[PDB]
Amino acid sequence: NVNSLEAYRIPVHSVTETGAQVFGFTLQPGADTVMERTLLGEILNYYANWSGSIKLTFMYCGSAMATGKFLLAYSPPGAGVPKNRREAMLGTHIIWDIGLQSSCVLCVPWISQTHYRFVSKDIYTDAGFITCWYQTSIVVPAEVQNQSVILCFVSACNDFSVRLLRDSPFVRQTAFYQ
Amino acid sequence: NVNSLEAYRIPVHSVTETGAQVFGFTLQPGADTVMERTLLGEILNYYANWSGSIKLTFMYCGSAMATGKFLLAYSPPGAGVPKNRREAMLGTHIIWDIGLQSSCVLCVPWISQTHYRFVSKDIYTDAGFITCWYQTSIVVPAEVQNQSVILCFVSACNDFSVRLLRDSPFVRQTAFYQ
Amino acid sequence: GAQVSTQKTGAHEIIHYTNINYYKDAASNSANRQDFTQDPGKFTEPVKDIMVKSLPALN
Amino acid sequence: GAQVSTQKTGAHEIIHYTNINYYKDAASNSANRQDFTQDPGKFTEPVKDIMVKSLPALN
Amino acid sequence: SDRVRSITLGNSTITTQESANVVVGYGVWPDYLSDEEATAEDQPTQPDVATCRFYTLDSVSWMKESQGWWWKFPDALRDMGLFGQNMQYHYLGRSGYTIHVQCNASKFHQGCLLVVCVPEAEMGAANINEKINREHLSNGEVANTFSGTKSSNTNDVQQAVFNAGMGVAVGNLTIFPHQWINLRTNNCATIVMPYINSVPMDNMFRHYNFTLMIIPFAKLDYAAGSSTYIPITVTVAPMCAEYNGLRLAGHQ
Amino acid sequence: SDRVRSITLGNSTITTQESANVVVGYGVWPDYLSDEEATAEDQPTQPDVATCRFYTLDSVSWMKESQGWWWKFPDALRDMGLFGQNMQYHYLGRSGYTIHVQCNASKFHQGCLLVVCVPEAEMGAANINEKINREHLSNGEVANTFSGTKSSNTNDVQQAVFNAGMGVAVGNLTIFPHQWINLRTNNCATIVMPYINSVPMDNMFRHYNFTLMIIPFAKLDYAAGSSTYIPITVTVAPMCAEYNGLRLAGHQ
Amino acid sequence: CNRSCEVPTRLNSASLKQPYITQNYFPVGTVVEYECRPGYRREPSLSPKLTCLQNLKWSTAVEF
Amino acid sequence: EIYCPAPPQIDNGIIQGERDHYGYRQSVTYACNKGFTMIGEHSIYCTVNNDEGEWSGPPPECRG
Amino acid sequence: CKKKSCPNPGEIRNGQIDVPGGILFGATISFSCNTGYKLFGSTSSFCLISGSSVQWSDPLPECREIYCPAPPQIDNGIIQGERDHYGYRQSVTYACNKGFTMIGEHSIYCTVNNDEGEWSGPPPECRG
Amino acid sequence: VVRVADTMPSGPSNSESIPALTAAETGHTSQVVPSDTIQTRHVRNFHVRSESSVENFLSRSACVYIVEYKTRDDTPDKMYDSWVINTRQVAQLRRKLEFFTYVRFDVEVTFVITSVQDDSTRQNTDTPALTHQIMYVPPGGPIPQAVDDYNWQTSTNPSVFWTEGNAPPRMSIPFMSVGNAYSNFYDGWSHFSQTGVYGFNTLNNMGKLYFRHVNDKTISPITSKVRIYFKPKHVKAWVPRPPRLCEYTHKDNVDFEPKGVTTSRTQLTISNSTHVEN
Amino acid sequence: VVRVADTMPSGPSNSESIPALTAAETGHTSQVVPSDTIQTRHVRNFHVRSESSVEN
Amino acid sequence: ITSVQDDSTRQNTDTPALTHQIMYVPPGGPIPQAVDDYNWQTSTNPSVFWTEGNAPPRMSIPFMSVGNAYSNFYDGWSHFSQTGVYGFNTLNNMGKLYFRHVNDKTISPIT
Ligand SMILES: CCCCCCCCCCCCC/C=C/[C@H](O)[C@H](N)CO
Numbered sequence A, B: 001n002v003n004s005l006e007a008y009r010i011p012v013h014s015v016t017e018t019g020a021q022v023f024g025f026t027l028q029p030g031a032d033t034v035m036e037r038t039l040l041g042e043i044l045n046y047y048a049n050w051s052g053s054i055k056l057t058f059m060y061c062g063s064a065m066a067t068g069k070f071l072l073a074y075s076p077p078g079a080g081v082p083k084n085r086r087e088a089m090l091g092t093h094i095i096w097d098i099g100l101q102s103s104c105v106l107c108v109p110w111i112s113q114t115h116y117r118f119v120s121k122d123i124y125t126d127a128g129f130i131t132c133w134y135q136t137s138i139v140v141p142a143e144v145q146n147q148s149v150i151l152c153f154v155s156a157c158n159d160f161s162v163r164l165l166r167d168s169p170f171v172r173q174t175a176f177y178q
Numbered sequence C, D: 001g002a003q004v005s006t007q008k009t010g011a012h013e014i015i016h017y018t019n020i021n022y023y024k025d026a027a028s029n030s031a032n033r034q035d036f037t038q039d040p041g042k043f044t045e046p047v048k049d050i051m052v053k054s055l056p057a058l059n
Numbered sequence E, F: 001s002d003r004v005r006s007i008t009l010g011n012s013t014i015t016t017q018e019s020a021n022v023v024v025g026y027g028v029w030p031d032y033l034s035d036e037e038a039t040a041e042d043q044p045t046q047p048d049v050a051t052c053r054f055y056t057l058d059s060v061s062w063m064k065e066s067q068g069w070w071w072k073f074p075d076a077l078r079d080m081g082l083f084g085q086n087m088q089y090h091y092l093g094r095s096g097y098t099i100h101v102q103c104n105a106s107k108f109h110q111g112c113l114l115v116v117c118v119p120e121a122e123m124g125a126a127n128i129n130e131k132i133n134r135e136h137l138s139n140g141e142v143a144n145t146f147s148g149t150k151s152s153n154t155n156d157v158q159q160a161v162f163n164a165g166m167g168v169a170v171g172n173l174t175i176f177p178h179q180w181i182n183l184r185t186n187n188c189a190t191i192v193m194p195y196i197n198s199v200p201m202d203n204m205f206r207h208y209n210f211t212l213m214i215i216p217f218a219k220l221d222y223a224a225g226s227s228t229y230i231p232i233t234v235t236v237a238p239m240c241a242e243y244n245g246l247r248l249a250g251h252q
Numbered sequence G: 001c002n003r004s005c006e007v008p009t010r011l012n013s014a015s016l017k018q019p020y021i022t023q024n025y026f027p028v029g030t031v032v033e034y035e036c037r038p039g040y041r042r043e044p045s046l047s048p049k050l051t052c053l054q055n056l057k058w059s060t061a062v063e064f
Numbered sequence H: 001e002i003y004c005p006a007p008p009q010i011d012n013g014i015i016q017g018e019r020d021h022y023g024y025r026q027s028v029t030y031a032c033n034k035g036f037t038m039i040g041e042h043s044i045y046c047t048v049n050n051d052e053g054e055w056s057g058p059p060p061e062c063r064g
Numbered sequence I: 001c002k003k004k005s006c007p008n009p010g011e012i013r014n015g016q017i018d019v020p021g022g023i024l025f026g027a028t029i030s031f032s033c034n035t036g037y038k039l040f041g042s043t044s045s046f047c048l049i050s051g052s053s054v055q056w057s058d059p060l061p062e063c064r065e066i067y068c069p070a071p072p073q074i075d076n077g078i079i080q081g082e083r084d085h086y087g088y089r090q091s092v093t094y095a096c097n098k099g100f101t102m103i104g105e106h107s108i109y110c111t112v113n114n115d116e117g118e119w120s121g122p123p124p125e126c127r128g
Numbered sequence J: 001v002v003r004v005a006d007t008m009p010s011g012p013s014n015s016e017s018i019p020a021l022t023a024a025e026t027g028h029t030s031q032v033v034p035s036d037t038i039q040t041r042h043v044r045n046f047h048v049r050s051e052s053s054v055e056n057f058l059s060r061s062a063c064v065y066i067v068e069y070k071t072r073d074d075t076p077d078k079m080y081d082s083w084v085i086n087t088r089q090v091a092q093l094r095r096k097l098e099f100f101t102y103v104r105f106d107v108e109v110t111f112v113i114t115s116v117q118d119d120s121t122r123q124n125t126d127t128p129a130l131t132h133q134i135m136y137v138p139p140g141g142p143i144p145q146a147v148d149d150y151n152w153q154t155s156t157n158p159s160v161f162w163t164e165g166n167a168p169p170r171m172s173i174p175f176m177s178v179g180n181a182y183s184n185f186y187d188g189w190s191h192f193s194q195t196g197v198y199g200f201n202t203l204n205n206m207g208k209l210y211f212r213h214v215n216d217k218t219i220s221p222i223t224s225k226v227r228i229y230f231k232p233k234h235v236k237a238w239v240p241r242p243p244r245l246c247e248y249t250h251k252d253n254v255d256f257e258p259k260g261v262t263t264s265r266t267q268l269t270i271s272n273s274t275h276v277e278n
Numbered sequence K: 001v002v003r004v005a006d007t008m009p010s011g012p013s014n015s016e017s018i019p020a021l022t023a024a025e026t027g028h029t030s031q032v033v034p035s036d037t038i039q040t041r042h043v044r045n046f047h048v049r050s051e052s053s054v055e056n
Numbered sequence L: 001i002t003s004v005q006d007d008s009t010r011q012n013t014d015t016p017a018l019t020h021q022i023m024y025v026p027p028g029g030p031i032p033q034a035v036d037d038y039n040w041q042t043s044t045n046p047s048v049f050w051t052e053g054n055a056p057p058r059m060s061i062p063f064m065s066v067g068n069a070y071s072n073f074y075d076g077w078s079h080f081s082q083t084g085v086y087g088f089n090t091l092n093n094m095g096k097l098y099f100r101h102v103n104d105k106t107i108s109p110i111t
């Protein structure tokens, strides 16, 4: 789905059993493959240190008759990835009720021991995990499409900062362009 | 007529049909062949940018019994060269009546999108066209010579400016002069 | 005709430097690496009828 | 014995420079590239009985 | 001297050195329509200097036996730049006019012209109870020509100079704003017509506002050796033009 | 409620009842060129409300597997009444724009659109080192259409949605003034672009100012029995337009 | 004896396939193709091909 | 379309750019040879009188 | 001396001519046909030398019109106003007979992919 | 800072004021502002006639000449060189200075010295750094005749020494003239009887430069060439003059081949292009 | 010297004030301070957006 | 600027210090066609000389553009008829640099 517009479409539908899940990735805006080539991640790859909070916005692009609740959760590192919904509700979560305001904001705060983390991968500055959980279900009436799509956004807060100018690991040149 | 004083003599006579024409050139004081080796054009060839308005003065050097009217017109670029007198009267023109004041002034203003144009030729800073039209005719009495001569002058206004010192493309040397 | 500014220094623990311009053109001067202002209100919040962020901002 | 002038700069958006003369002769000094005055009234309009430019200036 | 006049409109300028007195209108100068005499309700288009400027029509040749020429002026300016373009997109329009007629000769020449602006010059047909084609009334920027004898072309205007097309004595046409171009002393044919109608705005195509006529009363006459080709050039400007009722492109 | 908005320009008015917030520009409102940043010397033509009004472009049909459409807006308004006529007679011109994109469905429908105005969206060619025809960049009021797979039509634009023609990540196009038409809740696609260029006035034909793109990220999806034909209508207005350098009629 | 390129760019994770690994004389417009070395695996977002350009130098080849 | 007839040739003189057909409002300009002097107007033009093509005047003449 | 000028290339009907560097000796012009139109012949000419003057190296090319093939007939349903030829951006609207129900989109339209006419999707179907 | 003049707004006009009708017969350039013929707008213009001043036009490091001399020649005359100082053997600075009839300035003078090893059999050497002497001889002084002449001992004449590898030599020179200004053009004779030499050659009288290697005769020939770069500064100029059309032929007169006025055309009117097709 | 913005302390909340529920459909980036969703503490932050300026 | 002695038979020399010239030609000026061309005499064109072993050459250049700013992207054509060249290549127009050795022809090649 990389070679399509399906990379941005997160599937959501009605599930025959709750306690479930939707997705998850690792909070590394410039090391993780998910938010690597994003606007924040490409500004952030010319640097080598970062600091501050990170926002996540989830636009539910489904029908107006559809409704449901989600569990948007952040887990600081030190333990593993949570495997249940009840392990992920011990973290920093918000329960999102879909309604007339079709989007919500998960704010990932700055929980660290150092003032800075590396924009590349080291084990000393691990940053946590972001998971989303089917909490209840998707409930639709008759003659309404069950399978809908969530879109996820990312940006930075007003306390975000970058520090060490380096060259980006994505530019590559073999010969002069002529 | 380059190798004579006939380069400066513009012919004018009585024409058997009006709606006509007299001459025309391209407003490039240092690129166009007409005003290339002029005083303004030779000051202007040591530079590479110019700006400001340009004057044109037309001394009618004919008899004192001769009379007639002309259409002195400037056409900003974007369309082609006008081919009628009615296409050239859509521009910036003045109608010149020959009388006791034997000369008139066509003032070419600064109609541009940039502050500067190049004194050499590029397509991005085209500057327009200068044409003169038999509007009516030359009317003379008996035993008076029909064929007379217009002289054209050029100078610059009080808002004219030149910018980039370069060497002139007209100096050429092969060996030392001894 | 010198001018004295502050040096970039650490926090939680005002050193000055001096500067003289030697050339007649302003393109010759050293680069201005000490302007830290910003205004991200034309890219974020680029709307009409400015929102409140506590109201629903709809209906 | 220094002297402080203004640098040549752009318009629509007063920077100073300093100058010291080191040699005893005035032919040694740097060139005066900042005099922008003019008076084109001896080459243009070089006549007697100064015209008005709105009158016919004849008869 | 008062023989010299400059006239500046838009990006166009006319200089004359043998003017006599610039003739100008019924005493009234053109001005935009007030909102106390107005009828249409939407905002007018006072376009710019892009219409209020001089346009040069075609030249007619004055020979020894020429009789007279005429134009119809809201219709003659129908392909003259953005002015004509506004005519094709609006329903109602309104303007005064600065007409400047030029003609020159030498001092060994003789002959006299009459230049009249006639409002509502409704022409009569050559054969009596028969229609007139529009191409015989107004031919755009191209002049129609009077004759000396009575004319009998089909679907055409009765063109005798001594009745001026309308059916009056041609020496009585000095009741309208006019001048003379006596080749002894003139070139100053202005007539700055105001807007003259019986309604505050009008359609440019369906109505002709006035008619310019250039009739030589003392014919052109010269000795052998002088210039035999003497053109007459008519230049015309709209003044305080405005437009109303914008819709699709009109009737060509 | 703040879901309702009226927009009045000239003799045209748009009412919407499911607006969300009318999106408008870089924070800057369009205004006429000041005479302290001006370059050209003759008097500008601020024409009237005759250009500052809404024009409706063609409608494109949003199917289940549609990918995206684009326009080039100084060039798309080239036959839209007197606006386009001023483009053909002047050399320099300048305007902001009020773009209002409309699209509607029912509450049993789902799907989401992105509406971006991109300044200087220089498109890349399908085959690499080869010219592009002008008809493939801008087709007037008629939209060009992106694809899903890479394209290899000769003298044509590389049209993949996931690179947006320009060669970037398509999720990064929210850096430009934009909206979303989520069919759950929207119709309010304004973008009131100011004049954005690197020169105070520019040519309308030789330069394209910006590019409107309507890309569905969450595709249109409905159950059997709903209306399958869902059009998308784009309406566009010039604001504070002015024109300069009048000459003969231009390049069609 | 036309113009020819050099040996294609030696990558530390890919080797040439086997019409191209032996033969010299690469003219202009020649495409060559790489395979994953043992033991590596393909990255699907990159196409492992190299075109030799007009100036007798290959296109940029980084890590396939 | 109404046409004037063929324009009359003058003695000792030619027509500058003689067209094959002459419609309404169109003129012929008469030149004159070396050693001859024009008399009268240079050009006559085409008229319609009684729905009939007709030249407006007599052609000029060159004496010398 | 100075360069000679080749003749003015003029126009291609339903195509462009791109003249980046004038039409002097040693120039290059390029050729491209519009949307829905296909180029047949030459893509470029040079202002070469020909005898005692300069001429263009290739003759003027031609822009033929691209057509999608005949639209597929659906079972139990006709086409509203079926045209004989279908060019670019043009669509067929499928109707449906009495006693039958449409499934899917009504209309498909004509596309060009790899310089080739092609309908955009499958035609619909009427079950009843 | 002296900006250029601005454009003022105007409107319609119908009066006996005629700025377009002038008399060019009275030696007089008309001063028609563009707001007098067309209707203009208010333009606040911020341009400066800065880089068109005579200082900013002439104060660039121009040149005058190239000079060649060797360090091992069998003939003793090619071991040093000399140059009688004028500014009229290179056409660019000559034409630029001959825009004006009188000039008055100081000169900043720079030398650019480059040495090339000549061709010989024993071409593999170990040569130390060459050292050059540039001696100026004022008008009338004694001239050297060899490289080991004792006239090079520069006790009163100003001379400059230079070592290979450093910054180039540069020195300033005041207004060294006997009149009130320099003469670009002199319409007269040297003798009172209107005989002798004609033109500007009577007034040059600047003395001359002499160039040698300070080192002794090397074991392999090396040719050195020094380029004299003249650069005027502190400039005043009087009674301007048209730019020259024809090409220069010699350095001591103004003699020329008659060249036409400009480049030709094929016809006196313009039109649209008649090349290839649509 | 223009430091980055600080974090303010907060507490429990039960009201009709909803900073998390926004509309991303209005071209608008939400400006949720981290003290609006979780209970935070007073952080006096001393970081400078210095080396991210367009000159630097 | 770095120089490498090329490969030849007579490779043992005694070469003095190389001197370089970098001449800038503004857009429209005359171009050199050889190393002994007289267009290198830099009377109005700015040129920089450099000797082997010193600090590298460095000079400052003002905002040399005809518009109000530089353009990274241009969505338009060179000709008014929407033909010609497309993109940012219409607006480059910076002139060009020319590079030579000030010395005469050596007895061994050095690149
Ligand atoms: C040891 C270094 C001394 C260098 C001496 C070289 C220059 C000394 C002579 C003065 C230069 C005069 C400049 C040219 C004079 C006038 O401009 C010309 N006659 C042109 O009219």
Ligand SMILES: CCCCCCCCCCCCC/C=C/[C@H](O)[C@H](N)CO
Pocket (backbone or CB within 6 Å): L022, L023, L024, L046, L047, L048, L059, L061, L064, L070, L071, L072, L092, L094, L097
């Ligand atoms: C003798 C030394 C002179 C050196 C001259 C070299 C540079 C002179 C040219 C000016 C450089 C312009 C910098 C690049 C311009 C813009 O950024 C590009 N168009 C990118 O948009």
